[PDB]
Design an enzyme around this catalytic site. Sequence first.
Site, PDB file in Angstrom:
ATOM      1  N   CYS B 177      29.741 -48.766 -21.562  1.00  0.00           N
ATOM      2  CA  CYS B 177      28.449 -48.140 -21.759  1.00  0.00           C
ATOM      3  C   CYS B 177      27.940 -47.202 -20.671  1.00  0.00           C
ATOM      4  O   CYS B 177      26.885 -46.588 -20.836  1.00  0.00           O
ATOM      5  CB  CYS B 177      27.417 -49.201 -22.095  1.00  0.00           C
ATOM      6  SG  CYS B 177      27.476 -49.778 -23.782  1.00  0.00           S
ATOM      7  N   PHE B 228      26.084 -52.216 -31.230  1.00  0.00           N
ATOM      8  CA  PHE B 228      27.146 -51.217 -31.274  1.00  0.00           C
ATOM      9  C   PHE B 228      27.420 -50.486 -32.583  1.00  0.00           C
ATOM     10  O   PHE B 228      27.579 -51.103 -33.631  1.00  0.00           O
ATOM     11  CB  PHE B 228      28.443 -51.794 -30.694  1.00  0.00           C
ATOM     12  CG  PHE B 228      28.318 -52.314 -29.276  1.00  0.00           C
ATOM     13  CD1 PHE B 228      29.023 -53.468 -28.889  1.00  0.00           C
ATOM     14  CD2 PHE B 228      27.489 -51.673 -28.326  1.00  0.00           C
ATOM     15  CE1 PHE B 228      28.907 -53.991 -27.572  1.00  0.00           C
ATOM     16  CE2 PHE B 228      27.358 -52.179 -27.004  1.00  0.00           C
ATOM     17  CZ  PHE B 228      28.069 -53.342 -26.628  1.00  0.00           C
ATOM     18  N   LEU B 280      27.957 -61.187 -22.598  1.00  0.00           N
ATOM     19  CA  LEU B 280      26.697 -60.688 -22.056  1.00  0.00           C
ATOM     20  C   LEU B 280      25.739 -61.792 -21.623  1.00  0.00           C
ATOM     21  O   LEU B 280      25.458 -62.715 -22.387  1.00  0.00           O
ATOM     22  CB  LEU B 280      26.009 -59.796 -23.097  1.00  0.00           C
ATOM     23  CG  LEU B 280      24.641 -59.147 -22.876  1.00  0.00           C
ATOM     24  CD1 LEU B 280      24.727 -58.041 -21.852  1.00  0.00           C
ATOM     25  CD2 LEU B 280      24.139 -58.612 -24.198  1.00  0.00           C
ATOM     26  N   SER B 284      20.562 -58.945 -18.131  1.00  0.00           N
ATOM     27  CA  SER B 284      20.929 -57.524 -18.037  1.00  0.00           C
ATOM     28  C   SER B 284      19.789 -56.491 -17.978  1.00  0.00           C
ATOM     29  O   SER B 284      19.873 -55.565 -17.172  1.00  0.00           O
ATOM     30  CB  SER B 284      21.989 -57.125 -19.084  1.00  0.00           C
ATOM     31  OG  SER B 284      21.519 -57.246 -20.415  1.00  0.00           O
ATOM     32  N   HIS B 319      20.816 -44.415 -21.094  1.00  0.00           N
ATOM     33  CA  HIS B 319      21.710 -45.017 -22.074  1.00  0.00           C
ATOM     34  C   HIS B 319      20.936 -46.134 -22.793  1.00  0.00           C
ATOM     35  O   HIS B 319      20.393 -47.024 -22.140  1.00  0.00           O
ATOM     36  CB  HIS B 319      22.973 -45.577 -21.406  1.00  0.00           C
ATOM     37  CG  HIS B 319      23.852 -46.331 -22.350  1.00  0.00           C
ATOM     38  ND1 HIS B 319      24.492 -45.723 -23.408  1.00  0.00           N
ATOM     39  CD2 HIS B 319      24.084 -47.658 -22.480  1.00  0.00           C
ATOM     40  CE1 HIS B 319      25.069 -46.646 -24.156  1.00  0.00           C
ATOM     41  NE2 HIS B 319      24.834 -47.828 -23.616  1.00  0.00           N
ATOM     42  N   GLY B 321      21.303 -49.032 -24.098  1.00  0.00           N
ATOM     43  CA  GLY B 321      22.114 -50.245 -24.154  1.00  0.00           C
ATOM     44  C   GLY B 321      21.491 -51.320 -25.012  1.00  0.00           C
ATOM     45  O   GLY B 321      22.178 -52.113 -25.649  1.00  0.00           O
ATOM     46  N   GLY B 322      20.167 -51.273 -25.057  1.00  0.00           N
ATOM     47  CA  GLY B 322      19.372 -52.195 -25.837  1.00  0.00           C
ATOM     48  C   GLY B 322      17.937 -51.766 -25.658  1.00  0.00           C
ATOM     49  O   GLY B 322      17.619 -51.063 -24.693  1.00  0.00           O
ATOM     50  N   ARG B 323      17.071 -52.182 -26.580  1.00  0.00           N
ATOM     51  CA  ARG B 323      15.647 -51.856 -26.532  1.00  0.00           C
ATOM     52  C   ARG B 323      14.998 -52.409 -25.259  1.00  0.00           C
ATOM     53  O   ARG B 323      14.191 -51.723 -24.629  1.00  0.00           O
ATOM     54  CB  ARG B 323      14.934 -52.413 -27.769  1.00  0.00           C
ATOM     55  CG  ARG B 323      13.446 -52.073 -27.856  1.00  0.00           C
ATOM     56  CD  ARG B 323      12.607 -53.298 -28.196  1.00  0.00           C
ATOM     57  NE  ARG B 323      12.494 -54.225 -27.072  1.00  0.00           N
ATOM     58  CZ  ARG B 323      12.850 -55.506 -27.101  1.00  0.00           C
ATOM     59  NH1 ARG B 323      13.377 -56.039 -28.198  1.00  0.00           N
ATOM     60  NH2 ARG B 323      12.697 -56.255 -26.018  1.00  0.00           N
ATOM     61  N   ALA B 324      15.406 -53.616 -24.859  1.00  0.00           N
ATOM     62  CA  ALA B 324      14.869 -54.262 -23.662  1.00  0.00           C
ATOM     63  C   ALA B 324      15.245 -53.536 -22.372  1.00  0.00           C
ATOM     64  O   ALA B 324      14.445 -53.509 -21.438  1.00  0.00           O
ATOM     65  CB  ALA B 324      15.281 -55.716 -23.602  1.00  0.00           C
ATOM     66  N   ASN B 352      23.580 -48.074 -30.641  1.00  0.00           N
ATOM     67  CA  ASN B 352      24.222 -47.923 -29.337  1.00  0.00           C
ATOM     68  C   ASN B 352      25.672 -47.507 -29.597  1.00  0.00           C
ATOM     69  O   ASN B 352      26.521 -48.333 -29.931  1.00  0.00           O
ATOM     70  CB  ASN B 352      24.138 -49.257 -28.571  1.00  0.00           C
ATOM     71  CG  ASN B 352      24.781 -49.214 -27.181  1.00  0.00           C
ATOM     72  OD1 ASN B 352      25.524 -48.298 -26.835  1.00  0.00           O
ATOM     73  ND2 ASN B 352      24.526 -50.251 -26.402  1.00  0.00           N
TER      74      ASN B 352
END
Lengths: 395, 405
Positions: B177, B228, B280, B284, B319, B321-324, B352
């Site tokens: 990522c 993903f 994961l 993160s 990037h 990677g996630g909303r959070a 993503n």
Amino acid sequence: LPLMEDVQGIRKAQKADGTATVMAIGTAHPPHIFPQDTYADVYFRATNSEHKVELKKKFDHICKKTMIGKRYFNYDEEFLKKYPNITSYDEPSLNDRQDICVPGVPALGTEAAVKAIEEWGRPKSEITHLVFCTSCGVDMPSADFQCAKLLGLHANVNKYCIYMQGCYAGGTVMRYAKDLAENNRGARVLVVCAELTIMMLRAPNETHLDNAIGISLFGDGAAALIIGSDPIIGVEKPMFEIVCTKQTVIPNTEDVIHLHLRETGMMFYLSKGSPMTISNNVEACLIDVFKSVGITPPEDWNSLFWIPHPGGRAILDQVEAKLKLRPEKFRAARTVLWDYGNMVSASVGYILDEMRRKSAAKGLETYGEGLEWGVLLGFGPGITVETILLHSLPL
Amino acid sequence: GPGMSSLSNSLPLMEDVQGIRKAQKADGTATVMAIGTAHPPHIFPQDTYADVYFRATNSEHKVELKKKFDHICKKTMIGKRYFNYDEEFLKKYPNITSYDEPSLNDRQDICVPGVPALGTEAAVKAIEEWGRPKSEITHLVFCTSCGVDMPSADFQCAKLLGLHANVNKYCIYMQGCYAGGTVMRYAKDLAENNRGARVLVVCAELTIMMLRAPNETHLDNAIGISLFGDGAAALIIGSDPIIGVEKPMFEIVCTKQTVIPNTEDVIHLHLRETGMMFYLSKGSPMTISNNVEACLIDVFKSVGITPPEDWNSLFWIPHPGGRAILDQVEAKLKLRPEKFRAARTVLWDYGNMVSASVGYILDEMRRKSAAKGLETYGEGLEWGVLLGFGPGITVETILLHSLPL
Ligand SMILES: CC(C)(COP(=O)(O)OP(=O)(O)OC[C@H]1O[C@@H](n2cnc3c(N)ncnc32)[C@H](O)[C@@H]1OP(=O)(O)O)[C@@H](O)C(=O)NCCC(=O)NCCS
Ligand SMILES: CC(C)(COP(=O)(O)OP(=O)(O)OC[C@H]1O[C@@H](n2cnc3c(N)ncnc32)[C@H](O)[C@@H]1OP(=O)(O)O)[C@@H](O)C(=O)NCCC(=O)NCCS
């Protein structure tokens, strides 16, 4: 925040002045010595293929013709007994190979890196870029991360992971290092090429003879280099300037050298005409690298020093013949092929090391056998040729 | 322009090393001059993803895990994703849709020729926008975390595109990522150190390499599968833009990669006999946010620029990677809710796409900026940062200067 007109000033201040220069070379190999004379016996016994007498005699003949005297591996016969799946032909074995190669390759690479940094003599804090290269094992975070971690480099070191670029990869790292060192003022690039061939190891097959031939060639090893532009006089030891770097794909030759990473590990495929593809196209690659920098190619190829990838004895023989080179021209390459075998990407680093060491020992005019210009050649899957034009410096 | 044929940039007649170097290097900053994007045809809407995924993976019997996954899908802020497979395609591969049955071979058979094919689709669009002949592309930087082979994905892309035999290829394998940032880093040095160099960057991903059945003891894997999506982004980068022919958009001023100490176990991906195994940890978004400011300060100070007191003065390509991750980075940098709009739009419409995500965001940003008649391609602002986040934890910080419209 600066204006539009200030962007160029930043660029001028950021770039280096001179040519990327090799200033240190370190090498490493695993401890287990495998002499080539006994390789047919050891390989067939370790792979429980002693019943294949006809294939053993044929393999023994190939081993005697390889011009490899010994190779080093991270395994012995005792280690291989713990992994019956690796020593078989098609049993699931990738997981085990990854478990060995993922931590093993950066460990071996780090050993070579330690030697290169020690020779260089400057603090490891001054390493700004790390180019790690391997065809043995893949993981996230990658081998470059692992090497930087083991060496304890700065958190902000720019890392480059060159995965699965095969036997041409030793040339590829020089191509990478050239741009990184030259485009960044003060940049010191640590190049590390490391290979653990257990990723390709398997039992011999009659219908797939070319895989056994690869196993008779491949050895483990690591080579590391410190490359940087604008060498600090009286501190650093400038040896080889990386003047021009070109990668060439020989058309319609994809089917020649193929390597696939499967559930059974890395499957090696080689056609019997690989030395011919390389030798017949090498001169064109050399003429191209010289013309790209406006230098007239020498009328006699013996006027240059040579670091050809020792992919096999036939590759060296045929390249030597096509370029009309005298036997002593490939001395460094043949010495490395003999003493260490084909260590994939690490081989050219070993040859460059052997060349500069012998040149310094004989008291020659330059690090490149007393000659000014030379070429480092990488050959591998594609068919791909990496042509690295080098200018050697005085002692 | 590069001035390849000009006298001031001509090669020395004698074999002068420094003279060759002066002629060989470029003058200006590496500039993004074309962006092309591509995605596979199969639309997978997120509101029905829990249903589609659990049915395709023979897991609809795990009722409590489905209710837990449906909640995760609602919180992802992804509206739809594109894949090279539909439900019919997955039925041909019951090993890929299982949790741990041998499946790497099948995933490789799909990803090895599929990733370069998808990447080529994006590259064709980038080349068409650029307008110059494909033979003038001197460097190819191919990037993927989906599939590995020898000769590599870069070779296959170059072959499919019909690039020159002497194109300098770079294969960025398994950089995850953060790889969308890594390609900009590579392209910067390649374009700037080589006069006339035109770098074709291609980021392509086929996430079927990571696809598997959900597991209760490995919930973090299903969470990655909910994020993903497949896609490709291609960029043409070069120094010294030719006025009247090329369209200079973003100047790549400073590029630094940073590792966050003691966070190796946070994002792990291993290529096994079962394909790519994703791991994961819960921490993160927090770890990335707590270290992002230090990375930004580093990228600015490395070029002598005093870091801005207000991070809102810059445009952003983070990037998704996630909303959070987006939410926490936004909060830590005290950014207004609209600074990450371009990133959130791409996350919504495409999910993503690993390395391809930032290229898509850069494309979304420049297109919306041009469409609104803004001052620059970077939302009317001059300076900005492209951020890549991934395994390590590694942060790729790319400082960009946008040029006017
Ligand atoms: C392997 C090698 C050392 C043998 O030396 P050699 O002088 O060519 O030996 P010989 O001609 O006596 O041949 C040995 C037998 O192997 C055969 N052979 C060689 N390469 C082969 C291949 N890739 N596949 C199948 N057979 C092969 C010959 O055909 C011959 O057997 P035959 O009489 O049954 O026809 C030499 O071919 C070599 O250096 N090859 C380079 C391989 C290479 O390319 N390595 C790098 C790619 S990663
Ligand atoms: C997945 C995500 C969209 C869910 O949004 P969210 O706002 O955190 O949602 P919720 O807090 O309601 O959480 C849903 C459930 O997931 C859990 N969860 C979140 N991340 C998790 C992880 N990595 N592993 C295991 N559980 C996790 C919570 O613990 C929660 O359940 P619980 O109450 O039963 O313990 C969000 O966590 C995210 O964006 N994570 C970033 C993912 C990432 O890191 N991507 C890049 C790696 S390449």
